[PDB]
Structure formats: structure tokens, C-alpha cells
Design an enzyme around this catalytic site. Structure first.
Site, short mmCIF file in Angstrom:
data_model
loop_
_atom_site.label_atom_id
_atom_site.label_comp_id
_atom_site.label_asym_id
_atom_site.label_seq_id
_atom_site.Cartn_x
_atom_site.Cartn_y
_atom_site.Cartn_z
N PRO B 109 0.80 -1.23 0.00
CA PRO B 109 0.00 0.00 0.00
C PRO B 109 0.83 1.27 0.00
O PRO B 109 0.26 2.37 -0.09
CB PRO B 109 -0.82 -0.13 1.30
CG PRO B 109 0.12 -0.87 2.23
CD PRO B 109 0.98 -1.78 1.36
N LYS B 110 2.14 1.19 0.14
CA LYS B 110 2.97 2.39 0.22
C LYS B 110 3.66 2.59 -1.13
O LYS B 110 4.85 2.31 -1.27
CB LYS B 110 3.97 2.29 1.42
CG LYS B 110 3.35 2.71 2.78
CD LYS B 110 4.40 2.91 3.88
CE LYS B 110 3.81 3.54 5.14
NZ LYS B 110 4.80 3.56 6.28
#
Ligand code: XMY
Ligand code: FPP
Ligand code: ZN
Lengths: 407, 323
Positions: B109-110
Site C-alpha cells: 500500500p505504500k
């Protein structure tokens, strides 16, 4: 006196700067305390071992690490396969700060490589054969100015580069990072940096860009990525550096920004967080602390009479203390915080921040502050482009003797 | 299909259904700089990706190959652009593509490209109906994920999904009152719905924030929020606020309350307040308490503020030189 501790992080008063969690434990406070616990082990390590602290920048060790990565990287860097001009810029700029010559055989091989990363339609890509992107484009133009030879400058297709920039420009004044990509304040900084270094700025290229950047300053005084987002050091450096290039820093509320960035220095650890109530990180030694010479220059440009003529408006000593004691890896390379592994990204920005904190200058007024042994002093860096000030002058003077494309 | 982590994964050069294609090596030049020593799997996928991209092969097998390339480097925007070409050319089911992207974001998710791709799908489908709940899941594992909060702000603003966000904000401040992304999200929701010019909302927000300060007096986000919602009208335009903060001085003190008082004083002096010189002295005293004892890390800042205040608000500041 003899009972006096010269290291700020080691004084007895300094214990008083530990986190006060008010007996309300939340994840933020737990994570903060865990770092302060680990950092305190670092600070106490001299006392507990009964040694006298020496703050030594491991130049020879970092040089070996940098010198080799410029040629070859382990598969750990597969995640950066679309960022290879970045690896060029970070390593070249670390070597520059460490006052390490760039062999003319390395310089020309870099030139040949970024040439292969350059797109026939303007811009550079993350590697050969990749589509162009503003972020590897900013890195390639920077790495090419660090080399600063006639060969390096001529790699840049200025005519096509301007075409690329225009194709990303948005009506509200923002830019895309690449065709089909996202919009955030990084593209504004990337576009203005390459465009001003190479002299391709036209009278309408950045129309409404200063106004878009200013909408990214939020209730905190920093700048978010897009309007409404939380203030962050990386976006705030991007936003303020871009406006300095455009001579529009006054679009921002510079007072509430100065107040914001100085509060991102950690009272205990001495380095900077990227945003309020997150953790300290050595790379914000540049993204956050770099914001202070930009602020200094802007307020001095408005005749603010209260500006210091010898220090930046952050704790230069404390920041050098954190980088030197906490971000050095004993095998070479710098890093985020104790317990993280090294990488060329933090190597570039830990040393870029160290250099900022070491060197104050506002006109003829120069004043340096070199914590630890005097050999720790680095070459200065330019707080807009984060390449050596000499390289910025040399590049702009070269490209100003060209015409802006299309005249 | 064959997942990139499957134990029976096979390299592309070993796949009979790929035998017609010649792989394209990376054009790194005769003496490379910053050359990454790729793993077998990685170099194999990208050699075949380079080939389909060079042809512009808009085939089903190519679509499956970009999945493998993305998992090896999900920041490769070139592979993502091609995947969106293939999505439209092959006329792929975009809800099946959403099931894919919810999974990829879950595991990495980053990253900028995964979230942008999700946004393009949502615009194509014109369907935000899964967003706030999916983002809520990403935030349940990292309540401060910048891309998650950016994506949430886009969905809410573009599809007018304001109805229940202040309630979501309230839930996460309950969980972590120091979550500065949530205080920012709280300002986003109000700024676009009622605004802070409604006197009841502003009062409610100031009462709420003080109640929070009273509870975690060293929490800096509540202090920054309180300053942010009041600094635009001018801190001195609220006469009661000063005495109320001084009433917290004994048992809820922090450097954050000291610094707020200097902020009130600065604005009072900028607005030609009564007892000008008295106020200037109170401010200068707090600047030195903060610079020397309470907030020493910011000594250069508080000293600069003390000089600014003296520079333009001393009794001599308006007075000619010859006097
Ligand atoms: C060896 C890998 C380093 C990872 C680092 C850098 N990184 C990057 C990759 C390519 C180009 C580039 O550009 C540059 F250098 F930032 F200008 C940055 C990322 O994506 C992730 N990061 C993680 C990180 C470390 N400390 C704070 N973060 C959050 C962060 C988020 C976004 C950005 Br963007 C920058 C930082
Ligand atoms: C191209 C260019 C000049 C880039 C500089 C911009 C820069 C450093 C941006 C950071 C952006 C971001 C999403 C940070 C959050 O990461 P995180 O939440 O993982 O880290 P954090 O907790 O420290 O905020
Ligand atoms: Zn970092």
C-alpha cells in the site's frame, strides 16, 4: 567548565526532553517511545562504555559504498529499477558532498547511460526503454549538472524537454508526473528545476502553477501533496523550492510555514519528522531542514530585520548530532534511524542535511558549525536544487548562452 | 495463469506458449553505471515485457505478463501504462480488475502507482461504492498511510460522499487522538461541508479540541488544529481564549501552551491592543523561557520571534532616530 557536556544530546537536561504520554497510551505514543528508547541507548553508549564521545563522519567507509554502487547494485535495488537516474543523482551528489572527484571515465559512462534513458519525445525515464517521467527527469538533469562537463550538458534535448513539460501541464496550473500519471506538488518542483537549470522557461509555461502550489498549504502551515492533504516535509520542500524558482514565495503564508517546519525537529532525537506525530528520519534532515535557508532567503528578501546573520532557524548542532551518532552505518552509507538498513537514498539526504546544518550563508555573512572532528565538514549544497552551488552557477551560465526553444 | 510466488512458477523462457517471442535484453550500454544485478525471475519477466512492449502486442498473454512485472516492481509506471492499454483494447472486465487492485494495494500500500490505477478504474466504472470501506481496511493496518488518505479525500470530494465522514473521523480520534492525518481529515470534512464561519460549528470544534487538550495535554495535533481553525480570523479576535488557556497553565502545561500564548500576544500586538508594552514584555519573557528552558530545540526560532516582536512593537519602534 569540566563538568560541562559539549554534546547537546548528552547533557543531563536532555533527559527532560523524553516523551510525555500523559498516561494515555496510543499507537503513536508507543511507537514514539520505542524510538526514544532505542536512541537513548545510542546516546548513553559512551557513558556506559566509559569512553569519551567522538563524532566522526566515516568518510572512507561511505566513499567505498558509493564508489561501488555507482557501478553495480545488488538485487535489493530491483524495487528501484524504474528509478535508475535517481540512483545516479543520489550517488553522484553524495560523492560531491564528500569532495570526491568524479573520474572522467565515470562521467562519460553516466552521460551515455542517461542518454539511453532519454525519451525521443522529451524527458528521461527510470531506465532505458521506459517512458519519460518527471521524477527521473529531475534526477537525470541534476546528475548531468553535477558532472557539468560540456558532454554532460549536451545530453539534454532541450527542445523536446520543453515539449514534454507542456504535455503534462494541467489547466488548474499543476503538472502530471507522466502521461497518464498522478498530479501532486512533486511535479511542480521537478518541472521548474529542470526548466530553470536548462533555460527553457517560457512566459506561459508555469501560468497558474504558483497559485496551485499555494492551495496546497493547509491549516498546519506546511504543504500537502494536493489541496486538502496533510502537510509533509517532502511536499513542503517541493512546494517552497518551486516557488523560489518562480519568484513567488510570497504566495505562501511564510510565517505559518516557518512555525510548522521548526516544530518538526524532535526535541529528544535532534532530527526531523516528516509530519506531526510521526517518527524521526534522517532523510528529513534535508527535506525539512532544507526549508530553512529557503525561508531565510525569502524573509531577507522582504527586509525582515530580525533574521540571524549566523544561524539557520533550527538546532544545527542537534541535527548534526543525530546524523553523526544515529544515522551512520559502520560499513558505509547512512540511514533512516537506528535499526534500519542503509540505502543510497538516505545516504544522499542524510549528507545533504548534514551539509545544510554545517553551513550558514546570507550574502557575505558566512558562518560554519562543524560538530565532532573538523574533517566532518562537507561541501555546501544549494538548497533549491540540492546540487553543489558551483554546479548550479556553471549550468545556468552555460544554458543561458542558448536561446529558449522557439525563441 | 500462474502466480509469481507459486512454487510451480516457471520462467517465461521455459513456457511453450511463449516460444515465438524473442526476449529483448535491457539496453544498458557497453559500460553500465548503477547496473542492478537482477534475479533470474526478475530479468526473465522484464526481458519478455520489453518484447511485448516493443511489438505493442495487445494479447491476453501480455496482460498476464504485466501482472508478473508489476509484482516484481510495482513502481514501474511503464508496465502500468501498458496494462491500462491492454485493459481497454482487450475490453477486460474492470470489476475483475478492481478485485486485482484491492489485493495488490493490500500487499504493497505504500506506493504511488497502485493507488493511481485504482483511481482510474473508479473513474472508468464511475463507481465509488467500494472505496470508503476498502480504504477503511487499509487504514485499519496503517492509520497514517498518505496515499490512502489522499485517495479517500478524492473519492469523497468527487462523488459527494460527505455524509458519514465526520463520524469516521470521530471513530479514529477515539482510537488514536494523536493521529495527525485524522485531525487533517477532520478539517477537510468541515472546510467543505459547513465551513468554520458557522459560529456554532467553530464553537463546537474549539470546545471539542480543548476537551482533547485537557485529556492529552502534550498531544501536539490538538494544539495545531486549535491554532489552525482560529488563526485565520485572528487569535486576538477571541478575547476569552487567552484567559482560558492560562487557566490550564498549572495542571495541563506543555511547551505547546507556552507557545500558543506567544502566538496570541503576537497577534494582539499586530492589532494595536491595550497595554501594548505590557503585552510585549509578557511575550518576550515567554520567548526566553521557551528558548532557554522549555523548548530549547527551537532556540533560534523563539529568539527570532523575540527580535521580530521587539523590532516592530517596542515603544521606540515608531519613534524617529533624532528623538
Ligand atoms: C532505497 C529506497 C528508498 C525509499 C524512499 C525513497 N523513495 C523514492 C524513490 C524514488 C525517487 C524518490 O525521489 C526522492 F528521492 F524522494 F526525491 C524517492 C520512495 O518512494 C520510498 N521512500 C521511502 C522513505 C524513506 N524515508 C521516507 N520515505 C517515504 C517517502 C515516500 C515517497 C517519496 Br517520493 C520519498 C520518501
Ligand atoms: C521528487 C521529490 C523531490 C520528492 C520529495 C518528496 C518526498 C520526500 C515526499 C514524501 C511523500 C510521502 C507519501 C511521504 C509519506 O511516506 P511515509 O508515510 O512512509 O513516511 P513518514 O511516516 O515519514 O511520513
Ligand atoms: Zn527516510
Amino acid at each position: 567548565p569540566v563538568w560541562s557536556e559539549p554534546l547537546y544530546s548528552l547533557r543531563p537536561e536532555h533527559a527532560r526532553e523524553r516523551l510525555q504520554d500523559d498516561s494515555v497510551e496510543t499507537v503513536t505514543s508507543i511507537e514514539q517511545a520505542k524510538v526514544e528508547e532505542k536512541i537513548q541507548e545510542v546516546f548513553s553508549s559512551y557513558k556506559f562504555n566509559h569512553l569519551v564521545p567522538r563524532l566522526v563522519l566515516q568518510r572512507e567507509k561511505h566513499f567505498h559504498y558509493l564508489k561501488r554502487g555507482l557501478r553495480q547494485l545488488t538485487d535489493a535495488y530491483e524495487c528501484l529499477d524504474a528509478s535508475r537516474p535517481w540512483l545516479c543523482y543520489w550517488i553522484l551528489h553524495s560523492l560531491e558532498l564528500l569532495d570526491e572527484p568524479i573520474p572522467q571515465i565515470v562521467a562519460t559512462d553516466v552521460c551515455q547511460f542517461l542518454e539511453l534513458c532519454q525519451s525521443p519525445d522529451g524527458g528521461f525515464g527510470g531506465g532505458p526503454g521506459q517512458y519519460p517521467h518527471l521524477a527521473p527527469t529531475y534526477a537525470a538533469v541534476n546528475a548531468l549538472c553535477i558532472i557539468g562537463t560540456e558532454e554532460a550538458y549536451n545530453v539534454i534535448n532541450r527542445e523536446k524537454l520543453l515539449q514534454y513539460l507542456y504535455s503534462l501541464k494541467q489547466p488548474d496550473g499543476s503538472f502530471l508526473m507522466h502521461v497518464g500519471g498522478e498530479v501532486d506538488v512533486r511535479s511542480a518542483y521537478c518541472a521548474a528545476s529542470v526548466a530553470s537549470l536548462t533555460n527553457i522557461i517560457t512566459p506561459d509555461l508555469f501560468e497558474g502553477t504558483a497559485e496551485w502550489i499555494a492551495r496546497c498549504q493547509n491549516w498546519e502551515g506546511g504543504i500537502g501533496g494536493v489541496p486538502g492533504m496533510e502537510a509533509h516535509g517532502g511536499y513542503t520542500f517541493c512546494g517552497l523550492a518551486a516557488l523560489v524558482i518562480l519568484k513567488k514565495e510570497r504566495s505562501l503564508n511564510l510565517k505559518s510555514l516557518l512555525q510548522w517546519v521548526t516544530s518538526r525537529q524532535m526535541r529528544f532525537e535532534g532530527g526531523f519528522q516528516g509530519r506531526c506525530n510521526k517518527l524521526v528520519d534522517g532523510c528529513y534532515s534535508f527535506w525539512q531542514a532544507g526549508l530553512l535557508p529557503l525561508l531565510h532567503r525569502a524573509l531577507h528578501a522582504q527586509g525582515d530585520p530580525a533574521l540571524s546573520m549566523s544561524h539557520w532557524m533550527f538546532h544545527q548542532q542537534a541535527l548534526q548530532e543525530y546524523i553523526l551518532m544515529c544515522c551512520q552505518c559502520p560499513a558505509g552509507g547512512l540511514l533512516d534511524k537506528p535499526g534500519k538498513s542503509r540505502d543510497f537514498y538516505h545516504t544522499c539526504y542524510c549528507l545533504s542535511g548534514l551539509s545544510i546544518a554545517q553551513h550558514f550563508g546570507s550574502g557575505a555573512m558566512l558562518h560554519d558549525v562543524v560538530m565532532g572532528v573538523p574533517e566532518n565538514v562537507l561541501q555546501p549544497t544549494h538548497p533549491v536544487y540540492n546540487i553543489g552551488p558551483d554546479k548550479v552557477i556553471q549550468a545556468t551560465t552555460h544554458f543561458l548562452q542558448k536561446p529558449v526553444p522557439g525563441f | 495463469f500462474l502466480s509469481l510466488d507459486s512454487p510451480t512458477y516457471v520462467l517465461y523462457r521455459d513456457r511453450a506458449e511463449w516460444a515465438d517471442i524473442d526476449p529483448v535484453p535491457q539496453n544498458d550500454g557497453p559500460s553500465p553505471v548503477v547496473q542492478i544485478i537482477y534475479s533470474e525471475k526478475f530479468r526473465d519477466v522484464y526481458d519478455y515485457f520489453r518484447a511485448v512492449l516493443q511489438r505493442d502486442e495487445r494479447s491476453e498473454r501480455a496482460f498476464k505478463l504485466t501482472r508478473d512485472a508489476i509484482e516484481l516492481n510495482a513502481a514501474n509506471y511503464t508496465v502500468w501504462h501498458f496494462r491500462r492499454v491492454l485493459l481497454r483494447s482487450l475490453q477486460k472486465d474492470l470489476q475483475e480488475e478492481m478485485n486485482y487492485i484491492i489485493a495488490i494495494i493490500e500487499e504493497q500500500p505504500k506506493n504511488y502507482q497502485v493507488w493511481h490505477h485504482r483511481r482510474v478504474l473508479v473513474e472508468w466504472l464511475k463507481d465509488p461504492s467500494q472505496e470508503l470501506e476498502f480504504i477503511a481496511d487499509i487504514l485499519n493496518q496503517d492509520a497514517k498511510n498518505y496515499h490512502a488518505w489522499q485517495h479517500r479525500q478524492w473519492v469523497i470530494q468527487e462523488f459527494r460522499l460527505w455524509d458519514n465522514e465526520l463520524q469516521y473521523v470521530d471513530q479514529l480520534l477515539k482510537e488514536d487522538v494523536r493521529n495527525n492525518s485524522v485531525w487533517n481529515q477532520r478539517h477537510f470534512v468541515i472546510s467543505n461541508t459547513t465551513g468554520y464561519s458557522d459560529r456554532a460549528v467553530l464553537e463546537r470544534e474549539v470546545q471539542y479540541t480543548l476537551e482533547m487538550i485537557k485529556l492529552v495535554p502534550h498531544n501536539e495535533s490538538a494544539w495545531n488544529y486549535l491554532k489552525g481553525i482560529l488563526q485565520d480570523r485572528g487569535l486576538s479576535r477571541y478575547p476569552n481564549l487567552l484567559n482560558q488557556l492560562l487557566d490550564l497553565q498549572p495542571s495541563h502545561s506543555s511547551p505547546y501552551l507556552i507557545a500558543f500564548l506567544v502566538d496570541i500576544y503576537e497577534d494582539m500586538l499586530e492589532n494595536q491592543c491595550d497595554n501594548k508594552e505590557d503585552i510585549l514584555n509578557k511575550a518576550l519573557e515567554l520567548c526566553e523561557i521557551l528558548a532557554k528552558e522549555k523548548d530549547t530545540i527551537r532556540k533560534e526560532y523563539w529568539r527570532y520571534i523575540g527580535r521580530s516582536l521587539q523590532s516592530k512593537h517596542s515603544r521606540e519602534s515608531d519613534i524617529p532616530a533624532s528623538v
